[PDB]
């Protein structure tokens, strides 16, 4: 009747109890999905903000609605502090996801069936860098680039090579599984000996570029593409940047209305609370620590005889290789999750084995750092896995070791803090 | 330092602020915008959930991600819900928004260069059903069908004509602004002939579909899409419904993985928050009062003798014709602005002049009838804006008028419910 009286608690009790239970749930496991954080309280209170009434199409002082003086600052604010935070010329901060932001640059730079070079899924690239169920792979010439089969590190000359073989009209580098550095410099001075705008996509890295501790793809990427979210631990969403003021134009129009509609201009409001976060002088050391308790869980499972892939890690990233041990990743983790420790299977690059079964798992640092872990938390979170692990080589139900190591994690987590 | 200690009043009060000015201007003006609603507070207290948190692409117990369990059922719950509401066997909660839903269908149903019908802009078509600047007008081989010139309705016949002269792919029915009915059953007979698919994109009527005040597309179309927003009076984000469940596989893997990433689990809770309040009893009486109040709204500009278009309305959207008065849509929204009502220009079918100009207005009702406005609350509403655009014909200068006007608006909007 009157909505403004309607509450949650009162008016939608499955969802108000749907929403307790993933609060708890959130609350009592070991989150080491790597694409997955916390965000702040605050984050959060604009992200339920009622900017979300507000028709926003276009850009701040050049919109296609009147009575957006309000939203406008929020959106100003969020571009301002994002360009400061990666000190660059552009920004955009209305892509709905990192999907989005990607397909703002393509739609900005390529023409269907235009050749694009990519990092291959197999070797660790993202869905919309070419992968065929995507629209990146259905409506573009996609080709790819792979690891080196022994070392499992990019390969320059490899890229090289295909660019000139392929004479793409589009280079992307970035990943959602790689555990070491990208050379930005290089692949700039690759894509402009073919005649090829570069994309870095750095959805996964966005916070260590933002920190200092990734090379900037900022002076070298014709287009930046990152979501909001993973290591820079703002709100769900996606965010292009650039240094070319031109192309930045391009993008603009790309995005709208190019590609989207109204933007959300809660989640903006949201963003820019999440940009002021990252400019603290405290965000450079959680990304120190994200890194530091990364390397610490993958001596630890080394420690307990287990391989990881490039045998360490220059990021949040660990990659555990199973293929000696004979466990399959999808088998690791689920019997992972039953034990409270939640990540994914991850498939090992030129492994025959169906990337649906995998003979990896791939853990990340960041959730559990922003509560607090550090590096011997993540020591004992590594033999954790590895008791895990040893079940699975010398059990066929693992059940009662799960259960053992859940009662492990409930001790271990409820010792750091969370939501109020 | 402890992230969760971090409340907006204290860490970003530059975003605080601009929050707390955006709910004063939303409670102080007459908005007109036909576009836009307000969402209940549980509607915005699950939009701001920690749901946010969790990576949940795939579809409800087939994710790409452990964990999910929770987030499970608030998608469960508003594919159910959107499901009993629109009485369809197929539904899509996760696209980010109404332009998002539509770039499934095309990626579902059609290859890059395929012929796709649709309204054009000048007749009140949407961007994405085949405009220039837009990927559906980039990237695909877009014709227009328009409204009658002499009656400015859509006509079949003509729109039969250009379905057997271009044969597309995709026929294409919905608007961005139209003040009428539109028959889907005449619609499928015409794809039928031609053997093109059909899409119903219904964002501005999707709450005149779900309480029967329109006919349904469900029995006639391979896809409908909309926003959850609008006259649905959800959070912000698309959908996607179907009786076909051959095409909704289809469109399942269209949306993901083909065009989006990770879904927003918080915005899908938000969903299913206003579909529920969408299947109360008094949303039907809604969205009655909503197509009274704006033929009530018509009805007084007429008295006062404005012009409009079609010579009134069949839904929430009133049209007014300019031409007759030498003010421009342009001027008008914008004095009307000033004067404390938001509304926008609006091209007049086959005018010459720009529509950067126009030489119309476009008002909607939904949103001050959600604030509790009746007939005669519009009729005063009618006459305001009469006043303005007297003044714009008489007056060198409209400031004066603006401020008197401001002072009425400002009485009356007092007068009704807002959030507390």
């Known amino acids: 009747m009157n909505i403004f009286n309607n509450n949650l608690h009162e008016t939608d009790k499955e969802i108000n109890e749907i929403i307790k239970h993933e609060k708890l749930r959130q609350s009592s496991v070991i989150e080491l999905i790597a694409s997955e954080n916390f965000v702040s309280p605050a984050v959060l209170e604009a992200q339920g903000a009622l900017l979300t009434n507000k028709y926003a199409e276009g850009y701040p002082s050049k919109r296609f609605y009147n009575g957006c003086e309000e939203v406008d600052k929020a959106e100003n604010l969020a571009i301002e502090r994002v360009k400061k935070l990666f000190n660059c010329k552009y920004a955009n901060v209305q892509p709905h996801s990192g999907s989005q932001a990607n397909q703002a640059v393509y739609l900005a730079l390529l023409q269907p069936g235009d050749t694009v070079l990519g990092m291959s899924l197999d070797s660790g690239g993202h869905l919309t860098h070419g992968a065929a169920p995507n629209m990146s792979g259905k409506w573009f010439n996609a080709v790819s680039y792979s690891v080196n089969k022994e070392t499992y590190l990019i390969d320059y000359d490899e890229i090289e090579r295909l660019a000139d073989l392929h004479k793409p009209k589009l280079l992307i580098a970035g990943f959602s599984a790689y555990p070491r550095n990208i050379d930005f410099a290089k692949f700039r001075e690759i894509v402009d000996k073919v005649g090829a705008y570069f994309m870095a996509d750095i959805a996964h890295i966005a916070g260590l570029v933002a920190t200092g501790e990734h090379q900037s793809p900022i002076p070298y990427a014709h287009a930046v593409t990152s979501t909001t979210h993973k290591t820079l631990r703002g709100p769900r969403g996606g965010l292009i940047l650039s ?82 041990d004979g466990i399959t990743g999808k088998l690791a983790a689920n019997s992972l999750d039953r034990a409270g420790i939640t990540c994914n299977k991850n498939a090992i690059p030129f492994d025959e084995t169906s990337p649906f079964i995998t003979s990896g798992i791939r853990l990340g640092t960041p959730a559990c750092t922003t509560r607090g872990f550090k590096e011997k938390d993540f020591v004992l979170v590594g033999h954790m896995v590895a008791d895990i692990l040893d079940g699975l080589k010398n059990n066929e139900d693992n059940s009662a070791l799960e259960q053992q190591v859940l009662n492990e994690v409930t001790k271990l987590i409820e010792l750091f803090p969370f939501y109020g």
Do not use: W
């Open 243 to 324: 240094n070319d003021e031109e192309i930045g134009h391009k993008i603009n129009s790309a995005l709208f209305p190019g590609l989207q509609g109204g933007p959300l201009m809660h989640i903006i409001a949201a963003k820019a609370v999440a940009f002021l976060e990252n400019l603290q002088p405290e965000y450079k050391s959680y990304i120190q620590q994200v890194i530091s308790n990364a390397k610490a869980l993958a001596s630890s499972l080394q420690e307990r005889g287990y391989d990881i892939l490039t045998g360490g890690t220059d990021n949040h990233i660990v990659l555990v290789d199973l293929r000696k």
